[PDB]
Design a protein around this ligand. Structure first.
Ligand code: AKG
Ligand code: AKG
Ligand code: MN
Ligand code: MN
Lengths: 317, 318
């Protein structure tokens, strides 16, 4: 009886938190820094308040920035075998139909990827060097001397070294579905550009989540794609909504969230804070590197956990 | 419907678990000690941003006050100075008493008389405490400013701002500061004696009770008795009725699922009391203390605490 009234009160506060939080803590545009910050300034101004920014002139020390290019990769590591994600439509690790679709895993010489990117050669579907798991040192070690194993002022600020360094090189059709990571992320564009769409963690009440049975694409011999359910896998929660084409009929509440878009260009470094929902688009053959630092699990993390569970518990998700 | 009653219980269940879940990750079992002042970066990353307390030793060695300051030294130095003194019948200024938020009687007495009371050479009705705050050290006792620093340099650099106020504290052992929290980063410097702190983290809010009280002020009558005059001009004030020293578990049973964190801060030591932390304060007789208030950043942790506070009310736990 009366409990229903208490439930709507709780729901109203959860619905009001995302607006309150952004007016106080979320920028109106992802800000630019004229130069790398000091470790103290970085932690106080961006890391602790959990706020994104793009740092200019932070890679001028990197040999890679003057050297890296599709022709340079061909000459330098063309024969190196790399892991390449293949999908029919360019959405790896994304909800397609009623399944969480995982990429097809293929080993291919880098040279081939470069030909496909340049339109020199074809392949069914969409290619993306996107292995992660610190794929830069793991698969293209010969490129390590062309960059720093870490961002010194950022590593000093956080008091720890990165847990992984990943290399990203994909087709323009290769889109990363909206998701969040429990890492502090420094995303460095060496060539081309990346188009980032953001939601802050405090938008959680309006970001829909559902459980999907996991599946993987299997690439046939006939040049088509099959779906192989991962029968021996626990189910995985994921965000079904496309921020670029949101289904406001199924999840009207996403309109009450507010996305923050931005583009990061070659030579620029983006600080993407921990737990921020992000969706990523790239230019054809974009070359990028990102540094992952495990986040600190403190009051901000415990608070988000409460927000995430209460979003579900209150029936907003 | 029947689902609504079940949904509300799932919410309340998560809220009641949050304080224990949060403290396992974020709240220490005991207040840690530091052997020397930290660097600005270390101070921000280890204590401020994670929002957790510590006591810093050997941080006041540059303060002449640490060698000079004492009850006798003050008498010679500022004994004739008139200062605002809080007076209450029982030693509890800014505390819930019955159906009113009781504010102390503020009187302007020369400091020479306060020292007499503390040393037992003289007597006064009720309990004396110099706690006016509002930066009462530069405002009322400017002669003492040379004996210390106008701010804490390594802390000011870390927080990127200057202190919003510097307060002088001196009171009887019977004068207790009720449990409350501030919207400030607080650096509490004990110059002489000792202060005993009892803490609750912000995340204990689900079980920390709050009520709205009519404000009233004590009035000392010429006969040495205390009258209660209500403050009609102020709107109702929210305050914590509960006494961590004698908890009324019959009235507020839910405090038992909270967990207090106690510690003592001695002369020469500096406590970092993080913003929004609930704290309750006792002092030895004539304890001498100074504290720096830096305004907190109103960031995501503030919004999160505001949400937790609001949810505590919407859900019926408070
Ligand atoms: O670059 C991408 O496509 C994804 C990047 C990402 O997911 C991350 O850095 O956390
Ligand atoms: O010194 C006391 O008794 C209380 C001080 C206090 O409330 C504070 O430092 O914020
Ligand atoms: Mn990511
Ligand atoms: Mn206080």
């Amino acid at each position: 009886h009366m409990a229903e009234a208490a439930l709507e009160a709780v729901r109203s506060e959860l619905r009001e938190f995302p607006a309150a939080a952004r007016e106080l803590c979320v920028p109106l545009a992802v800000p630019y820094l004229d130069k790398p910050p000091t470790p103290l300034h970085f932690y106080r101004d961006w890391v602790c308040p959990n706020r994104p920014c793009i740092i200019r002139n932070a890679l001028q020390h990197w040999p890679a920035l003057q050297k890296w290019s599709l022709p340079y990769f061909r000459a330098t590591v063309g024969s190196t075998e790399v892991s390449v994600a293949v999908t029919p439509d360019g959405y790896a690790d994304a909800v397609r139909g009623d399944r969480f679709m995982m990429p097809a895993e293929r080993r291919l010489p880098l040279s081939f990827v470069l030909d496909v990117l340049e339109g020199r050669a074809q392949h069914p579907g969409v290619l993306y060097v996107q292995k992660q798991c610190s794929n830069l040192p793991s698969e293209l070690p010969q490129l390590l001397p062309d960059l720093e194993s870490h961002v010194p002022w950022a590593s000093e600020a956080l008091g720890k070294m990165p847990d992984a360094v990943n290399f990203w090189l994909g087709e323009a059709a290769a889109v990363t579905s909206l998701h969040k990571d429990h890492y502090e992320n420094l995303y460095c564009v060496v060539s081309g550009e990346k188009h980032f769409l953001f939601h802050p963690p405090s938008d959680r009440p309006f970001i829909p989540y559902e459980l999907y049975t996991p599946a993987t694409y299997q690439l046939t011999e006939e040049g088509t794609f099959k779906v192989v359910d991962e029968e021996a896998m626990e189910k995985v929660p994921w965000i079904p909504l496309d921020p670029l084409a949101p289904d406001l009929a199924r999840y009207p509440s996403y309109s009450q969230a507010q996305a923050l878009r931005c583009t990061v260009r070659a030579g620029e470094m983006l600080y993407l804070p921990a737990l921020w929902f992000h969706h990523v688009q790239q230019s054809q053959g974009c070359i990028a590197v990102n540094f992952w630092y495990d986040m600190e699990y403190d009051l901000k993390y415990s608070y988000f956990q409460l927000l995430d569970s209460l979003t579900k518990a209150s029936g907003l998700d």
